[PDB]
Enzyme design. Structure first.
Site: not given
Ligand SMILES: OC[C@H]1O[C@@H]2OC[C@H]3O[C@H](O[C@@H]4[C@@H](O)[C@@H](OC[C@H]5O[C@H](O[C@H]([C@H]2O)[C@@H]1O)[C@H](O)[C@@H](O)[C@@H]5O)O[C@H](CO)[C@H]4O)[C@H](O)[C@@H](O)[C@@H]3O
Ligand SMILES: OC[C@H]1O[C@@H]2OC[C@H]3O[C@H](O[C@@H]4[C@@H](O)[C@@H](OC[C@H]5O[C@H](O[C@H]([C@H]2O)[C@@H]1O)[C@H](O)[C@@H](O)[C@@H]5O)O[C@H](CO)[C@H]4O)[C@H](O)[C@@H](O)[C@@H]3O
Ligand SMILES: OC[C@H]1O[C@H](O[C@@H]2[C@@H](O)[C@@H](OC[C@H]3O[C@H](O)[C@H](O)[C@@H](O)[C@@H]3O)O[C@H](CO)[C@H]2O)[C@H](O)[C@@H](O)[C@@H]1O
Ligand SMILES: OC[C@H]1O[C@H](OC[C@H]2O[C@H](O)[C@H](O)[C@@H](O)[C@@H]2O)[C@H](O)[C@@H](O)[C@@H]1O
Ligand SMILES: OC[C@H]1O[C@H](OC[C@H]2O[C@H](O)[C@H](O)[C@@H](O)[C@@H]2O)[C@H](O)[C@@H](O)[C@@H]1O
Ligand code: GLC
Ligand code: CA
Ligand code: CL
Ligand code: CL
Ligand code: MG
Ligand code: MG
Ligand code: MG
Ligand code: MG
Ligand code: MG
Length: 1060
Positions: A537, A534, A599
């Site tokens: 960017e 993942d 997403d």
């Molecule tokens: O547990 C691993 C991981 O799970 C989640 O992310 C997986 C998720 O990544 C991509 O989409 C994300 C979106 O969910 C959101 O995430 C923000 C979030 O990032 C961290 O937590 C992630 C989970 O969200 C975790 O490490 C962070 O700890 C937390 O505080 C934040 O809120 O937003 C981002 C930015 O736009 C996005 O990239 C992916 O596309 C998606 O399929 C996957 O489920």
């Protein structure tokens, strides 16, 4: 005063500015230059000013003026004025309060630019594998050179050196040149490149003279942006486009499939939920395909803007950025080919072929962010089993310590210094994951393969975490990060996803080897099957510097693909069945696994955008494309959306469900069982099963198409104009597509819709579910309730299938990837057709099958190659009077049970109008011939009906029934019928029952009237056929039956058959 700050480029974001930037970032001649400066804290008596030089001469200081306050900061604007081309400006911004301590930023330098264009060609040197055009320029002192070469005889490469100091690359020698005073013409067997010399202007034609594309009418189209001394900052060219030209591709695009009228940015970006509205994308590629039969690829990783008739209505342009380096040539290709899909193939010659994935990648993938412990995995597997969901892929996201992202959550261990790798036995596994190897074994036991989520960044949230801190120390000591431009490790900007995290420099092979070494145990010992790579960017900052010497402007678009490719190659080196699943990239992304559309919310609008994303990605060479079916976030999908999405997803390249929330109550899984739970609609399950089972029935076709992508650049799912570029009705379609070579799929992507318009290109299309025949060359209206998906097979199609003994689509064959149940070939005979089947079950042998349709002589012949398995043909036809295999009679089986018991035989499926023919495995070709056969019936029940209905209460009909009674004025049954073998007289068989008395009906054949006599049948359970002479023209014929004032008596009307 506590401080002052100005930094001219900020984070170099395309879409936003920091509040302390220079505007414009890179000033051109005549542009007013503003410097935005901040001071803090807010205080009276602050002074902010700029000390500067112009061309080395000290200027009077500029005083900045107050602009606004925000928080504890004041923002100021200093106006430097406008400048001339060639001006070199150096400035320092300064702040102090009441003549006290002065704080400064800088010095910063900019070089003021303007555009120079090619003027004339002054001489042409043909070097045999390359042609040099020596040029004059409209301004400045350069002596430009444009180099022409052929990547192949249908693929032209242009390389421009504005200074003339660089040299183009060699290409093919198979061209000739006619070089005169006024014009130079370069010719291959596929292209004619016509170049006027004064003014320089290029037209690209096919060898026959047909214009593909050309530089803009007024010439001076090709140019560079320079100060004439230090920098070249941009390139452009400009081209003529007629008003009907459509432009496809540009990577993965969410807003539209045809970019005409838009400025398209080649810029990777992580935009959550609103990709279509913002017109942003994770996967941006500087390549497009035109329906005027060429593609254009600008070969650079720098940001470019494609202006597609967005400024001037008959002009398209590209503007390509550069880092200032005067030695970087502009490099672009104009790509021709045998057809539109071949243009994509030629593009993948340049940028890399899709790598064929293992077959498990093409089954259902199950995912949910909430799955975060072994009991969740166990219940996902047991829920799938209890609901008969034979998936093949499994994703874990919430699996790790959420600090290192290579250690299982709750695992304990002795921390390691100096980046040393762990082995499985270094861990004590606890809590949520007591036995990861065992968990993986259970996934494999279900016939599934598992991938683990990853990012390209070392997380640094500022908290103390021993192993991560150790790793960070080590990474910096080796120079494994990128550099910020000052000697410190590059960190993601604080406001962004994984802000403050340190990117691994994937251009540094030592860095990559270290990073991947830390994950090695996951593949060698835990036994995983790849990574969901993942992100990516994450490169901002013009001064951000990588081990290849490239900086942030050049590397932003390339970084995700370096990351994804590094992991894909690494996983495959250990586990040859490993698959990557990623979202971001640029040109070459297609080499390294699956791309999903990111997403999106669970709405029909999102569904529409997802489909556009897949169709554009497809044109751009990204064929193995997925989406989170029905959306992964927002309010839970409706039963309607879930059902519509399921159908499309089953007929897309990669099928995958997924959900965002990490610990929700109730569950947010987009699994079919949870959808039943959340919506209360139990019918979701059998509908999901139908589509999943159908996908598995089609897996041999799907996987052959996957190989065709890898070998020949033909994407699995294609927008209609890829196959029908001249068809004016196909240009803008974004709610139907081709799937493999043969299937036209028309999903319902609108809430509340049940009448689906389907545009059918010329040729006969057959409904794969029920045998309904649809002549092409119009838009039809197909009634599709919420459980129904219009899918049609093109004329001549040979479609391999893996069937149960039931031999119908949507029957569960399981998820065995290493054998077939009943290997079947569905055939829609039309002239001579052929198909190369990828028999992956038997060592990947290509099986060349051909069908020769000869309905004029009541015959269809199938040349079956040597096969390792028993095969069943399903031939769309009327019932044969005999069938032979190598001249030997094969007996008719009266029932499906008898057919299944037989070693060889044939059986006629009256509902589907399919002749099943069973042949033994043999290490030699077998000639199958069906005798006494005609084109399959046109069922009355599938006709256009007026004031008449259907029934099925007397046995012996073909199809699903018959039209009942049909015995009053203003009742009609209309057929659209193809002339089987061209314009000719034919015999129309009319099959009916008339149990009470002799009947008559009136028929019109393309407006020509006759009355037909339908003699009484013994009873309503007895069918008879009357032969009616008709004259049919080529293609579609309107055949209208009605009951008029001079007609009489009731009938039941079963079908018509057309025969010679
Ligand atoms: O547990 C691993 C991981 O799970 C989640 O992310 C997986 C998720 O990544 C991509 O989409 C994300 C979106 O969910 C959101 O995430 C923000 C979030 O990032 C961290 O937590 C992630 C989970 O969200 C975790 O490490 C962070 O700890 C937390 O505080 C934040 O809120 O937003 C981002 C930015 O736009 C996005 O990239 C992916 O596309 C998606 O399929 C996957 O489920
Ligand atoms: O049970 C007797 C009779 O009932 C139904 O028809 C009622 C209908 O009968 C007479 O007209 C019919 C006419 O409707 C048409 O019927 C075709 C029909 O015949 C059978 O079914 C009918 C019932 O529909 C049944 O015999 C047959 O099973 C079915 O498959 C067919 O569609 O044509 C016949 C012959 O011309 C005619 O007898 C009666 O005159 C009329 O008033 C009454 O409404
Ligand atoms: O909502 C509490 C949650 O917020 C943060 O995580 C969310 C994550 O749960 C996910 O939520 C999707 C959800 O977002 C909005 O609430 C929206 O109105 C709704 O329709 C949609 O279904 O995604 C968002 C954005 O990625 C995250 O911010 C916290 O991280 C988490 O601790 C909280 O539980
Ligand atoms: O590298 C950090 C840390 O990792 C392991 O500990 C993980 C985790 O173990 C228990 O769940 C504790 O309750 C948590 O506080 C820990 O973070 C290693 O065992 C440990 O030595 C190391 O410092
Ligand atoms: O492609 C043929 C046809 O398919 C669907 O209709 C099938 C439906 O047709 C009649 O109503 C029969 O009586 C039923 O037994 C069949 O299930 C589409 O709805 C239709 O639009 C299409 O033409
Ligand atoms: O900050 C890290 C956290 O990010 C998200 O909230 C994850 O769901 C959680 O598992 C993790 O601990
Ligand atoms: Ca019928
Ligand atoms: Cl500059
Ligand atoms: Cl981000
Ligand atoms: Mg080629
Ligand atoms: Mg959970
Ligand atoms: Mg293995
Ligand atoms: Mg270095
Ligand atoms: Mg629309």
């Amino acid at each position: 005063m506590d401080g002052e700050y100005h930094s001219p480029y900020g984070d170099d974001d395309l879409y936003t500015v920091q509040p302390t930037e220079r505007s414009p970032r890179d000033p051109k001649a005549g542009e007013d230059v503003i410097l935005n400066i901040t001071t803090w804290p807010i205080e009276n008596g602050q002074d902010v000013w700029v000390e500067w030089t112009k061309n080395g001469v000290a200027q009077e200081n500029v005083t900045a003026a107050y602009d606004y306050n925000s928080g504890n900061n004041t923002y100021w604007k200093a106006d430097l004025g406008k400048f001339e081309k060639g001006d070199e400006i150096t400035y320092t911004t300064k702040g102090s309060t009441n003549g006290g301590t002065a704080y400064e930023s800088g010095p910063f330098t900019f070089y003021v630019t303007d555009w120079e264009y090619v003027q004339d060609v002054t001489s042409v040197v043909d070097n045999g594998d390359s042609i040099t055009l020596n040029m004059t320029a409209t301004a400045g002192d350069f002596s430009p050179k444009l180099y022409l070469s052929f990547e192949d005889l249908d693929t032209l490469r242009m390389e421009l050196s504005p200074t003339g100091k660089e040299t183009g690359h060699a290409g093919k020698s198979g061209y000739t040149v006619e070089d005169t005073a006024e014009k130079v013409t370069v010719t291959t067997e596929d292209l004619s490149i016509e170049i006027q010399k004064s003014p320089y202007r290029m037209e690209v034609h096919q060898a026959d003279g047909t214009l593909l594309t050309s530089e803009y009418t007024t010439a001076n189209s090709l140019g560079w942006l320079t100060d004439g001394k230090n920098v070249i900052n941009q390139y452009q060219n400009n081209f003529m486009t007629p008003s009907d030209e459509a432009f496809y591709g540009f990577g993965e695009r969410y807003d539209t499939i045809n970019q005409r009228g838009k400025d398209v940015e080649t810029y990777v970006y992580n935009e959550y939920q609103d990709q279509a509205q913002t017109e942003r994308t994770y996967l941006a590629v500087p390549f497009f395909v035109s329906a005027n039969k060429y593609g254009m690829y600008v070969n650079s990783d720098f940001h470019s803007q494609f202006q597609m008739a967005s400024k001037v209505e008959d002009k398209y342009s590209f503007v390509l950025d550069n880092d200032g380096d005067m030695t970087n040539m502009l490099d672009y290709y104009v790509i021709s080919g045998k057809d539109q899909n071949d243009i994509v193939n030629n593009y993948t010659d340049i940028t890399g072929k899709t790598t064929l994935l293992p077959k498990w990648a093409f089954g259902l993938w199950m995912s949910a962010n909430e799955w975060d412990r072994e009991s969740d995995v166990s219940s996902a597997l047991s829920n799938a089993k209890a609901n008969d969901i034979p998936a093949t892929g499994f994703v874990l996201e919430q699996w790790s310590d959420e600090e290192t992202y290579y250690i299982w959550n709750n695992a304990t261990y002795t921390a390691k210094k100096n980046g040393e790798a762990f082995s499985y036995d270094d861990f004590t596994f606890n809590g949520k994951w007591t036995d990861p190897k065992g968990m993986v074994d259970s996934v494999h036991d279900a016939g599934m393969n598992i991938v683990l989520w990853q990012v390209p960044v070392l997380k640094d949230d500022g908290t103390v975490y021993e192993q991560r801190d150790n790793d960070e120390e080590y990474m910096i000591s080796q120079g494994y990060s990128a550099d910020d431009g000052t000697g410190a490790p590059y960190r993601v900007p604080a406001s962004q996803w994984f802000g403050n995290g340190i990117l691994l420099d994937f251009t540094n092979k030592d860095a990559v080897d270290w990073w991947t070494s830390q994950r090695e145990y996951l593949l060698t010992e835990v036994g995983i099957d790849g990574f969901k790579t993942d992100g990516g960017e994450m490169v901002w900052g013009r001064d951000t510097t990588f081990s290849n010497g490239e900086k942030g402007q050049e590397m932003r678009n390339r970084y995700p693909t370096d990351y994804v490719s590094s992991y894909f190659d690494f996983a495959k080196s250990i586990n040859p069945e490993a698959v990557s699943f990623s979202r971001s990239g640029t040109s070459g992304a297609q080499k390294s696994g699956i791309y999903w559309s990111g997403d999106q919310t669970s709405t029909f609008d999102s569904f529409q955008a997802s489909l556009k994303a897949g169709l554009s990605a497809s044109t751009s060479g990204v064929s193995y494309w997925a989406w989170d079916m029905a959306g992964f976030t927002g309010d839970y999908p409706t039963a309607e959306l879930y059902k519509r999405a399921t159908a499309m997803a089953a007929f897309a390249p990669i099928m995958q469900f997924h959900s965002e929330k990490s610990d929700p109550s109730p569950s947010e899984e987009r699994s079919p069982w949870n959808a039943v739970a959340r919506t209360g609609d139990e019918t979701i399950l059998p509908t999901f099963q139908k589509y999943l089972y159908t996908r598995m029935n089609l897996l041999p076709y799907i996987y052959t198409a996957a190989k065709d992508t890898a070998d020949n650049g033909k994407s699995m799912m294609r927008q209609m104009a890829m196959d029908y570029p001249e068809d004016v009705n196909a240009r803008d379609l974004d709610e139907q597509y081709m799937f493999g070579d043969d299937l036209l799929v028309a999903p319902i992507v609108q809430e509340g819709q049940t009448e689906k318009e389907v545009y059918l290109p010329e040729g006969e299309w057959v409904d794969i579910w029920n045998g309904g025949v649809h002549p092409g060359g119009e838009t039809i209206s197909y009634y599709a309730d919420v459980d129904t998906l219009p899918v049609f097979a093109k004329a001549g199609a040979i479609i391999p299938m893996n069937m149960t003994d039931g031999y119908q689509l949507g029957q569960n064959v399981g998820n065995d990837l290493k054998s077939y149940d009943n290997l079947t070939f569905r055939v829609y005979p039309s002239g001579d057709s052929e198909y190369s089947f990828y028999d992956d079950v038997n060592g990947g042998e290509m099986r060349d099958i051909s069908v020769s349709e000869d309905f004029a002589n009541e015959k269809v012949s199938v040349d079956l190659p040597a096969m390792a398995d028993e095969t069943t043909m399903q031939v769309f036809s009327t019932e044969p009077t005999s069938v032979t295999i190598d001249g030997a009679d094969v007996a008719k089986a009266d029932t499906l049970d008898a057919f299944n018991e037989a070693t060889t035989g044939y059986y006629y499926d009256t509902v589907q109008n399919l002749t099943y023919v069973k042949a033994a495995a043999k290490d030699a070709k077998q000639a199958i011939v069906l005798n006494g056969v005609n084109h399959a019936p046109y069922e009355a029940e599938f006709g256009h009906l007026t004031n008449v209905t259907t029934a099925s209460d007397h046995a012996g009909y073909t199809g699903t029934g018959f039209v009942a009674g049909f015995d009053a004025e203003k009742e009609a049954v209309e057929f659209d019928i193809d002339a089987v073998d061209g314009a000719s007289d034919y015999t129309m068989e009319v099959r009916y029952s008339a149990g009470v008395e002799d009947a008559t009906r009136t028929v019109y054949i393309n407006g020509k009237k006759q009355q037909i006599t339908l003699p009484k049948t013994a009873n309503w359970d007895t069918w008879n056929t009357v032969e009616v002479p008709v004259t049919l023209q080529a293609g579609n014929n309107q055949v209208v039956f009605d009951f008029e004032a001079d007609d009489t008596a009731g009938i039941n009307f079963d079908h018509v058959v057309i025969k010679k």
